[PDB]
Enzyme design. Structure first.
Site, mmCIF file in Angstrom:
data_model
loop_
_atom_site.group_PDB
_atom_site.id
_atom_site.type_symbol
_atom_site.label_atom_id
_atom_site.label_comp_id
_atom_site.label_asym_id
_atom_site.label_seq_id
_atom_site.Cartn_x
_atom_site.Cartn_y
_atom_site.Cartn_z
ATOM 1 N N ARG B 10 9.716 0.435 -6.331
ATOM 2 C CA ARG B 10 8.773 0.260 -5.187
ATOM 3 C C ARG B 10 7.613 -0.638 -5.760
ATOM 4 O O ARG B 10 7.140 -0.625 -6.859
ATOM 5 C CB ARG B 10 8.269 1.601 -4.660
ATOM 6 C CG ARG B 10 7.606 1.690 -3.388
ATOM 7 C CD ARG B 10 6.752 2.642 -3.041
ATOM 8 N NE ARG B 10 5.422 2.094 -3.164
ATOM 9 C CZ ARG B 10 4.167 2.710 -3.407
ATOM 10 N NH1 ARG B 10 4.161 4.174 -2.759
ATOM 11 N NH2 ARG B 10 3.016 2.233 -3.686
ATOM 12 N N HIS B 11 6.760 -1.107 -4.696
ATOM 13 C CA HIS B 11 5.680 -2.025 -5.162
ATOM 14 C C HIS B 11 4.670 -1.157 -5.486
ATOM 15 O O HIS B 11 4.580 0.157 -5.394
ATOM 16 C CB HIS B 11 5.059 -2.645 -3.977
ATOM 17 C CG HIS B 11 4.834 -1.621 -2.833
ATOM 18 N ND1 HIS B 11 3.543 -1.050 -2.456
ATOM 19 C CD2 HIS B 11 5.474 -1.289 -1.768
ATOM 20 C CE1 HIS B 11 3.646 -0.253 -1.539
ATOM 21 N NE2 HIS B 11 4.734 -0.536 -0.910
ATOM 22 N N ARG B 60 3.122 -7.559 -1.942
ATOM 23 C CA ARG B 60 2.774 -6.437 -2.971
ATOM 24 C C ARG B 60 4.376 -6.169 -3.770
ATOM 25 O O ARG B 60 4.101 -5.686 -5.045
ATOM 26 C CB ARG B 60 2.451 -5.222 -1.940
ATOM 27 C CG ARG B 60 3.595 -4.729 -1.166
ATOM 28 C CD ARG B 60 2.869 -3.781 -0.105
ATOM 29 N NE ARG B 60 3.665 -3.242 0.984
ATOM 30 C CZ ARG B 60 3.872 -3.672 2.082
ATOM 31 N NH1 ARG B 60 3.599 -4.625 2.520
ATOM 32 N NH2 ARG B 60 4.667 -3.147 3.025
ATOM 33 N N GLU B 84 10.109 -4.258 3.801
ATOM 34 C CA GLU B 84 9.832 -2.797 4.312
ATOM 35 C C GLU B 84 10.251 -2.708 5.860
ATOM 36 O O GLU B 84 10.021 -3.731 6.478
ATOM 37 C CB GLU B 84 8.228 -2.497 4.034
ATOM 38 C CG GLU B 84 7.778 -1.018 4.504
ATOM 39 C CD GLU B 84 8.867 0.109 4.034
ATOM 40 O OE1 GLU B 84 10.114 0.025 3.941
ATOM 41 O OE2 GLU B 84 8.060 0.781 3.127
ATOM 42 N N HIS B 159 10.172 -1.441 -1.364
ATOM 43 C CA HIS B 159 9.439 -0.759 -0.349
ATOM 44 C C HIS B 159 10.008 0.600 -0.279
ATOM 45 O O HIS B 159 11.114 0.677 -0.313
ATOM 46 C CB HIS B 159 9.047 -1.320 1.009
ATOM 47 C CG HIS B 159 8.426 -2.942 0.631
ATOM 48 N ND1 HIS B 159 7.136 -3.126 0.583
ATOM 49 C CD2 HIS B 159 9.221 -3.964 0.899
ATOM 50 C CE1 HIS B 159 7.326 -4.471 0.409
ATOM 51 N NE2 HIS B 159 8.341 -5.050 0.430
#
Ligand SMILES: [Ca+2]
Ligand SMILES: [Ca+2]
Ligand SMILES: [Ca+2]
Lengths: 233, 234
Positions: B10-11, B60, B84, B159
């Site tokens: 995940r970011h 991100r 996302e 995401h």
């Protein structure tokens, strides 16, 4: 009135086998490496201020749980319903021994959570005898998920088969999908969240998997040392 | 039987995360702590010698992937299929704003992977656009799970919504049970293993959830500096 966080911690490595010898309810002890792994996990989990700790009575789990108790100032409550799956005729046997007796049976077993070809318990049986502990704690611990410190977790310290069966049951996964959860590692932990529901209905609580099989990073020098402490070769 | 390891990262944290403000496909920036946590996850994941990296185009995630690329020497591939969930009319709104405009909607959404009252994508939509990337990688990367170094993972950087939907789809959980997989944390990662017998097609690979939402441990000293750097950059 928030979510109830439920953490499940698997014991560390035992002094018995480091491979495929199944243990079940045999009461094996942690190795020096397993005690070091238990410290590493307790260092991470202790920071989160557990509300209470409940452990299997099997020493590998209890001694893991005590490391977390020492770091949190909590006493380890012991509950026999957290024992590992009873593996019947397969306790103390390696994969190689099982596979020679009944080729294909161990792999069919992993995929059928209702099956116990060994005279012991199925994963469904294990969930059925451990889920009542979670329901009792919901009923008896008003501070769990309460308004004062809603994120303090209940920590269960147990075993890989128990944790997978209990997690899948709480999540209401269909039994066909219980094998989706890979095996818990040495001193790894899992976290579920039980989301608020009206009344006192435990069945109305909806659980969701927050963490599966997380672990503490431990340095290669420490792993090498702790492994060596156990042997004279 | 062989196994292919798939890691999904995940970011790192953004200011919207701190503010409980839904991001979706808005192109928000990593915070100082997001950058720091991305470095720490790259330190852990880099030791696994990733085979390749694919990232969402949202900055991100891309900026998180770049920390792993710098640690490993690998190029970061970019794929919009890893974006996302589009969260429709919820993008840019806080939880409180959503709850005031549509009480119960956020809860329904958390409990139903087909639900999209915001007008954007459901988790089924997100899995449907992203799973073909994984099939393409299986078909085009013979080294993945291959002879030399079978355990080197493919890393996707994306995401939390994407990761939950794509993981549930690979596991072939029924859609009704996709909400069993919750959130992912700040630069946390998930690992699935795809087990297959030689000769099998993509659908014959059986995926298992090895790890969901693991994180790198970070010292209190480095959390305190990233907080001072985020504060001093008002
Ligand atoms: Ca330590
Ligand atoms: Ca036989
Ligand atoms: Ca010894």
């Amino acid at each position: 009135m928030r979510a109830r966080r439920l953490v499940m911690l698997r014991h560390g490595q035992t002094d018995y086998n480091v491979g495929s010898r199944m243990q079940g309810q045999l009461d094996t002890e942690l190795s020096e490496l397993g005690r070091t792994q238990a410290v590493a996990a307790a260092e991470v989990l202790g920071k989160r201020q557990p509300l209470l700790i409940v452990s299997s009575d099997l020493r590998r789990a209890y001694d893991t749980a005590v490391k977390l108790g020492e770091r949190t100032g909590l006493v380890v409550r012991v509950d026999t319903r957290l024992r590992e799956t009873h593996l019947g005729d397969w306790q103390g046997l390696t994969h190689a021994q099982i596979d020679a007796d009944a080729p294909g049976a161990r792999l069919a077993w992993r995929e059928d959570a209702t099956w116990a070809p060994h005279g012991g318990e199925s994963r469904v049986d294990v969930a059925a005898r451990s889920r009542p502990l979670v329901a009792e704690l919901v009923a008896s611990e008003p501070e769990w998920g309460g308004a004062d410190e809603p994120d303090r977790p209940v920590v269960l310290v147990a075993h890989g088969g128990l944790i997978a069966a209990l997690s899948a049951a709480l999540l209401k996964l269909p039994v066909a999908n219980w094998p989706a959860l890979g095996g818990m590692g040495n001193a790894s932990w899992t976290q579920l969240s039980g989301h608020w529901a009206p009344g006192s209905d435990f069945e109305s609580i909806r659980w969701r998997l927050d963490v599966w099989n997380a672990s503490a990073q431990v340095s290669s020098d420490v792993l090498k040392l702790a492994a060596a402490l156990e042997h004279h070769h």
